[PDB]
Amino acid sequence: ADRADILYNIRQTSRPDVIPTDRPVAVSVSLKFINILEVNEITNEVDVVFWQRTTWSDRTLAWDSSHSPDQVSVPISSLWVPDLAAYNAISKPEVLTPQLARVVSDGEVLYVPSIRQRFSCDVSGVDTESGATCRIKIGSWTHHSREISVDPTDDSEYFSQYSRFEILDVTQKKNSVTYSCCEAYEDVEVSLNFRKK
Amino acid sequence: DRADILYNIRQTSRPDVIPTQRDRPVAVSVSLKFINILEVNEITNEVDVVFWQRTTWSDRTLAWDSSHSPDQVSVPISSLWVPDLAAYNAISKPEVLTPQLARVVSDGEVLYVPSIRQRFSCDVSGVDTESGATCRIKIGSWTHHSREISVDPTTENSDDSEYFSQYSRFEILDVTQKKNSVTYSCCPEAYEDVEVSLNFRKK
Amino acid sequence: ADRADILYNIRQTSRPDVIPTQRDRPVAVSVSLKFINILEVNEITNEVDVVFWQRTTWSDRTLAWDSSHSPDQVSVPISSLWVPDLAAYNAISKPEVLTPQLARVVSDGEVLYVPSIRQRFSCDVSGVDTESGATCRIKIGSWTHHSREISVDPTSDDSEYFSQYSRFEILDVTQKKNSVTYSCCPEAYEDVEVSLNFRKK
Amino acid sequence: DRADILYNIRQTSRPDVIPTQRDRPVAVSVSLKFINILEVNEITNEVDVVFWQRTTWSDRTLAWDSSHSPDQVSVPISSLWVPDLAAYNAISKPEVLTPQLARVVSDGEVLYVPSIRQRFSCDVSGVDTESGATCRIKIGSWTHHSREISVDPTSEYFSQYSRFEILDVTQKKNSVTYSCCPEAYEDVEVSLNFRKKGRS
Amino acid sequence: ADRADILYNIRQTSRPDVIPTQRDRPVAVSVSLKFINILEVNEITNEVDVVFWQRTTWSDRTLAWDSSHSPDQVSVPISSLWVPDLAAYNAISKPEVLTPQLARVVSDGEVLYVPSIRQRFSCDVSGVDTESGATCRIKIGSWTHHSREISVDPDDSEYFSQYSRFEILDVTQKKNSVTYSCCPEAYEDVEVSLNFRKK
Ligand SMILES: C[C@@H](c1ccc(C(F)(F)F)nc1)[S@@](C)(=O)=NC#N
Ligand SMILES: C[C@@H](c1ccc(C(F)(F)F)nc1)[S@@](C)(=O)=NC#N
Ligand SMILES: C[C@@H](c1ccc(C(F)(F)F)nc1)[S@@](C)(=O)=NC#N
Ligand SMILES: C[C@H](c1ccc(C(F)(F)F)nc1)[S@](C)(=O)=NC#N
Ligand SMILES: C[C@H](c1ccc(C(F)(F)F)nc1)[S@](C)(=O)=NC#N
C-alpha cells in the first residue's frame, strides 16, 4: 500500500459529517500565540494570531502500516473535524494556512491551523507591569460533553519579536458552559497574560 | 448508528422544499441573544452587533425510530431545509461566525444557533442617556408568506445578562421580542416577523 | 402534485442558461428599485452607497404547471432558474445581495425576484445639502442581451420603503426607459434610468 | 433553438484547454474603455479605475450551422475557455462588476466585456498639472507564451462625474522574455493620460 | 494526442491530494520570490504589505506523457494537480492570489507555478527611513510535510515597480530546517530577507 491507497481507503471509511464516537470523542486543544496585532482598551477587543493545535482519534481511519507509510497529510474536507468555535470571537476565524491534517495509521489526527481572529476579552492592565488577562474560550459549537470532551495539553517560543506586546504567561484550563437556549458543552479557557513592551 | 441516521436524513431531506405538514405553515421560532455591541453611530443610525440567532422548527420527513439509537445528531445545514430568514433592516450580509451545524432530534425537531455579526439601520437616539436607545431588528421569511412560514418568539421579555459580554462599552437595559406582520405593495400576502427591541446605552 | 413535485418538474424544464423567449419575441423584464437606505454620500467624489429592493419580474412559460389541485406558487433558488443578466452601468462596486437568493414562481410561469442589494454608484451628488437636493441617476439594463432578446420596462416618492433613520430623505424617484447603441455592437441595449432626487435632512 | 446551441456548446467546449487550431496562436484582442477614475494617490503612485475590458477571440470548437437557427447566444464564461489575462501592475484582484456572460457567434467568435474595478501601481506624477499623469496598465496571458496566445490592441463612456478627465488613451503591443522561461509573453500596454478637473 | 487529450490523461493519473514522492525520496520543491511592490509599511505596528511572484517548481512523474507526437507543455488549473502546501509563517493575512491559478506542466512531469501574491507580514520595519533600510524576513515552507516528504531550496529588483515609494537594496534567500514542539520531525523553510528603504 502506497500514499494513494491510504488516501483511497480513508475516503472509503471516513464519514466527514459523523462524529466517530458509549463515550465522548476526546479532543485536545492547545494555542501557541504568534502575534497580538491590535488592542482596544475602550472596546475590550484584541486581534491575535495563534496556531490551534487540535488532536483526536478516529479509529475508522486506521490502516495496517507494517508495509506502508504510517502517516499522511489529508485535506480536512476528507475527515471528520471537531466543530470547535471560539465562544468570545467577534470575527470569523481567518485560517492563514493550508487546511490539511496529518492522519497516523492508528487513527490519531493532528490539525494545526494558523488563525487570525478578533476577540471580546478583558484588556484592562495591558499598559501596566502585570499586564492584561485575555481569556479565549474554545469548545464544540453543537456537541455536548457526552459527545465531545475538550482537554488542554515555553509560551513565547513562536511569538513574534516584532509585536508591540509581549507574553508574560499562558494558562489553559478545562471548563463547562450550560446556556438555557441549548446540556453542558466543554471548553478550554486559554488565559493570555500580555502587556505592551 | 449516527452514520445510518445521517444517511437516512440525506435520503428524505429536501433542502429546497418547505416541509409543510398537511398545508399548515411551518412554525419557526426565532430568539436573538445579544452577545456584543461593537460599533454604534448616532449620526448614521447604524449598529454592528453579534448575536446568537436561536432558530427551531419541525421537519417530520427527518424523524427516525430512536428506541435503540441516538435520538439527536449534529447535521450540516446544507443537508437540511432552513427557513429563508432575513433581517429586513440589515445593511450588511449576516456574517456567520460559527460552524454551520444544526441539531436534529429523532421526532424531527431542528435547533440551529448560528453566531452572527451584522450591521443594522435602527434608531440610535438616546444611546448616551440613562434610558438608552431602542434599536428594532425585524427578522422574518424573505419569500414565504404567513400561510407557508409563521414566526414566533421564544422569550418575549429579558435583559439578556445570561449572554451579553460585560466587557462591551454598552450595557443592555432590556430586550423585547414580539410577533408582527408586514404587507408590502409588491404582493397581496403578509410576511410574519419577530421585532426585537434592543434597549441599550453607553456605560 | 406537492411542492417537491413542483420543484422537481421546474428543474426538468428550467434551463438556467437559456433566455426563455416565446416565438423570438424579447423577454419582457420589469425592474423597479425601492430605495431602503442611503448610507454614504460623498459630494467631492460624486459617490453614493445605497440599499434598495430590486423588484424584478418576467415570464418563463417552460416553468408552468397545472395548479388546479396543487399550490400555484413556490419559492425556488435562483440557481434553478434563468434570471435576467441586469447590471447597473454606473455602479463602482459589485451588487452585495443581502437576502436569501430565492424567487417566487407562479404556476402560469410568472417569476418575481426581489433581492435587497447594497451597491456604490458614481452619480451627480451636487445639491445634496440644498432644498432641491441631488438627482443621482442609476442606469440598469441587460449586460449581454440586446432589445430583440430582452426588453426592460419600469413598473413615486418611495415613503412606503425608505428608512426614516437615514440622514437623507427622498424627494422623488422617476424610472424611465432608454435604448442605447454601443460602439462594440450593432444592436440596441435597453435600460431603465432611475432618477433618485434626495437631500440631507 | 438557443437551448440546442447551448447543449452543443457544452458537448464540444473545453473550458480548461486553449482552442489553438493546428500550430497557430489564439489571437486575443483586448481594448479598455475607461469608465471612472475613483481614487488617485500621488504619494503612493496608486490609482483605482473602472473599465470595460473588451476581449475577443475565436474558439472554432463552439461554431455551429446558423442557416436555420440564431447566430449568437449569451453563454456563462464558466462554460467557455477564456484567456488567462492578468494586469502585471495590478495590486488588487479584478472586481468584476457585471454578469459573467460572453456572446458566442456561430462562426466561433467570442466577445466578453467585463466591467472591472481594479487598483494599479502606476505613474500618477503630473495628475494636478495641465499635461496630466500617464498611468500604464500592462495586460497579457499569465501562462500562454507567444506561440499559444497573441494579444493585439484595437473617453466615449467616461463618467462626467469623475474628479478626473481623460486627455488620451494609447494601446501598444509588447513581447517580453522573463527569467523563469525561454519563451516570450505578449502584452498590451494601455497608456491612460488623465488629469484632475479642479485647481490644487 | 492534442491538448484536450493531455489534460484528460493528466486527470486520469493526477492525485491532487497525494504527494508524488518516488521511492521514499522527498519532493524537491524550488521556491524563489521576485518582489514586485511594497505597498504599505507601518513602522509603529511592524507590518508590511508586499506583492511578489512566488516562482515554484517540482516534479510529479505521475503527470508525465509521451510527447513524441503532441505538445510537450500545457497550462493546467492547479485544482487538477498536487501543489505543495506552502505557507508564510509570519503572514498576518491570507495570500491574495492576483493572477489566474494555472501552472505549466512539461511532458517529463516538471511543474512551474508562479502566482502573484499580495500578503501582509509581521516583520522588522525599523530603519526603513534610513540609508541602510529595514530587513523584513519572510519564512516560507510546507505547512504539513516534514523534511522526508518535502524539501525546499532557493537579480532582485528586476521586476520591482519603479513607482513604489520604496526601493530594494538586497534580497538574500537561505534554507532552514526547524523542529516544532507538536511533532518529532523537521520542517524545511526558505527565509527571504528583503532589505528595503523609502526613496
Ligand atoms: C510545521 C507546522 C505543522 C506541522 C504539522 C501539521 C499537521 F500535522 F497538523 F498537519 N500542521 C502544521 S507547525 C509550526 O504549525 N507545528 C507546530 N507547533
Ligand atoms: C452593452 C454592453 C455589452 C454588450 C455585449 C457584451 C458581450 F458581448 F460581451 F456579451 N457585453 C456587454 S457594453 C456597452 O458593455 N459593450 C461594449 N462596449
Ligand atoms: C510570464 C509569467 C508566467 C510564466 C509561466 C507561468 C507558469 F508556467 F507557471 F504557468 N506563470 C507565469 S511570469 C513573468 O510571472 N514568470 C516569471 N518570472
Ligand atoms: C450556544 C452554543 C450552541 C449550543 C448548541 C447548539 C445546537 F443547536 F447546535 F445544539 N448551537 C450552539 S454553545 C456550545 O453553548 N456556546 C457557547 N459559548
Ligand atoms: C420585499 C420582500 C419580499 C417579498 C416577496 C419576495 C419574493 F416574491 F421574491 F419571493 N421577495 C421579497 S418582504 C418579506 O415583503 N420584505 C420585508 N420587509
Total CB pairs under 8 A between chain B and C: 69
CB pair distance less than 8 Å for D76 and C17: yes
CB pair distance less than 8 Å for A157 and E181: yes
d(CA A105, CA A108): 7
What region does E172 belong to: left with phi over 0, alpha with psi -120 to 50, or beta?
A: beta
Burial class (CB in 10 A: 0-12, 13-18, 19+), C24: exposed
Which of C55, C56, C67, C75 would best serve as a mutation to test chain B binding (most B beta carbons within 10 A)?
A: C75
Nearest residue, CB atoms, E51 vs list D43, D91, D122: D91
Nearest residue, CB atoms, D74 vs list C91, C94, C145: C145
d(CA D138, CA D192): 11
Cell numbers for D29: 484582442
| Total residue count of chain A as it appears in this document | 197
The experimental method behind these coordinates is X-ray
d(CA E148, CA E137): 25
d(CA E106, CA E61): 10
Q: What are phi and psi of C14, to 5 degrees?
A: -65, 130
Any chain C CB within 8 A of the CB of B92? yes
CA dihedral B156, B157, B161, B167 (to 10 degrees): 90
Please note each residue after which chain D is broken, C-to-N distance over 2.5 A, or write none.
Answer: 154
For residue B182 and ligand 5, the question of a CB distance below 6 A is answered with yes
Q: Domain limits at D50?
A: 2-16+23-196
Contact yes or no for E116/E176 (Cβ under 8 A): no
Contact yes or no for A136/A86 (Cβ under 8 A): yes
CB pair distance less than 8 Å for C145 and D96: no
- For chain E, how big is the Rg over CA atoms in Å? 19
Residue E13: strand, helix, or coil: helix
Residue C11: give its domain's CATH number: 2.70.170.10
d(CA D28, CA B57): 54
| C-alpha pair distances (Å), D48 with each of A84, B82, C143, D51 | 40, 40, 22, 10
d(CA C87, CA C78): 16
Q: Are strands E27-42 and E150-153 parallel, antiparallel or unpaired?
A: parallel
Distance of CA D167 to the CA centre of its chain: 21
What region does C47 belong to: left with phi over 0, alpha with psi -120 to 50, or beta?
A: beta
- Start-to-end CA span in chain B (Å): 51
User: What secondary structure does DSSP assign to chain B, as a single string?
Assistant: -HHHHHHHHHHH--TTS---STTPPEEEEEEEEEEEEEEEETTTTEEEEEEEEEEEEE-GGG----TTS-SEEEEEGGGS----EEETTBSS--EE-S--EEEEETTSEEEE--EEEEEEE---TTTTSSS-EEEEEEEEESS--TTTEEEEES-SEE--TTTS-TTSSEEEEEEEEEEEEEE-TT-SSEEEEEEEEEEEEE-
CB pair distance less than 8 Å for C77 and B16: yes
Nearest residue, CB atoms, B84 vs list C3, C102, C165: C102
Instruction: Quote the ligand 2 centre to D75 CA distance (angstroms).
Output: 13
d(CA D198, CA D195): 9
Cell numbers for E77: 488549473
| Nearest-by-CA chain E residue for A115 | E92
Write the single-letter amino acid at A139: G
- Residues in chain D within 8 Å Cβ distance of C85: 74, 99, 101
| C-alpha pair distances (Å), D197 with each of A174, C1, D164, D170 | 64, 64, 5, 21
- Residues in chain C within 8 Å Cβ distance of B184: 160-161
Q: Which residue, among A1, A6, A58, A97, has the nearest Cα to E17 in the 3D structure?
A: A6
- Residues in chain C within 8 Å Cβ distance of D79: 17
d(CA C87, CA C84): 9
Write the single-letter amino acid at D28: V
Number of the ligand 5 atom closest to the C-alpha atom of C99: 12
Q: Are strands D133-141 and D85-87 parallel, antiparallel or unpaired?
A: antiparallel
Cell numbers for B82: 432552513
- Residues in chain A within 8 Å Cβ distance of E14: none
Q: Please, do chains C and A touch (3+ CB pairs < 8 Å)?
A: no
Write the single-letter amino acid at A70: D
Position C166 in a domain = yes
d(CA B181, CA B149): 12
DSSP state of E92: S
Write the single-letter amino acid at D40: V
d(CA D79, CA D60): 15
Domain count along chain C: 1
What region does C107 belong to: left with phi over 0, alpha with psi -120 to 50, or beta?
A: alpha
d(CA D115, CA D113): 7
Alpha carbon of D40: minimum distance to chain C alpha carbons (Å): 11
Q: What are phi and psi of A69, to 5 degrees?
A: -55, 145
Question: Which single residue is written with the C-alpha cell 399550490?
Answer: C71
List the Cα angle D5/D9/D13 in 5-degree steps. Answer: 175
Resolution (A): 2.0
Any chain A CB within 8 A of the CB of E91? yes
Cell numbers for A39: 488592542
Q: Which residue, among D199, E149, B57, has the nearest Cα to A69 in the 3D structure?
A: E149
CB pair distance less than 8 Å for E44 and A164: yes
Count of beta carbons in the 10 Å neighbourhood of residue E54: 20
Any chain C CB within 8 A of the CB of D54? yes
Write the single-letter amino acid at A119: F
Cβ contacts of B18 within 8 Å, gap of 6 or more: B26, B81, B144, B148, B149, C3, C75
Q: What are phi and psi of D59, to 5 degrees?
A: -135, 95
Q: Are strands D149-152 and D26-41 parallel, antiparallel or unpaired?
A: parallel
User: What secondary structure does DSSP assign to B11-60, as a single string?
Assistant: HH--TTS---STTPPEEEEEEEEEEEEEEEETTTTEEEEEEEEEEEEE-G
- Residues in chain E within 8 Å Cβ distance of A163: 46, 122
Residues β-bridged to residue A33: A50
Contact yes or no for C123/C48 (Cβ under 8 A): yes
Cα diameter, chain D: 62
Contact yes or no for B124/B1 (Cβ under 8 A): no
Cβ contacts of E184 within 8 Å, gap of 6 or more: none
d(CA B193, CA B177): 10
The alpha-helical segments, DSSP class H, found in A89-164 are none
Cα diameter, chain E: 60
Count CA atoms closer than 13 A to E73's CA, side-chain side: 17
Residue A154: strand, helix, or coil: coil
DSSP state of E99: S
d(CA E156, CA E32): 10
Count of beta carbons in the 10 Å neighbourhood of residue E13: 12
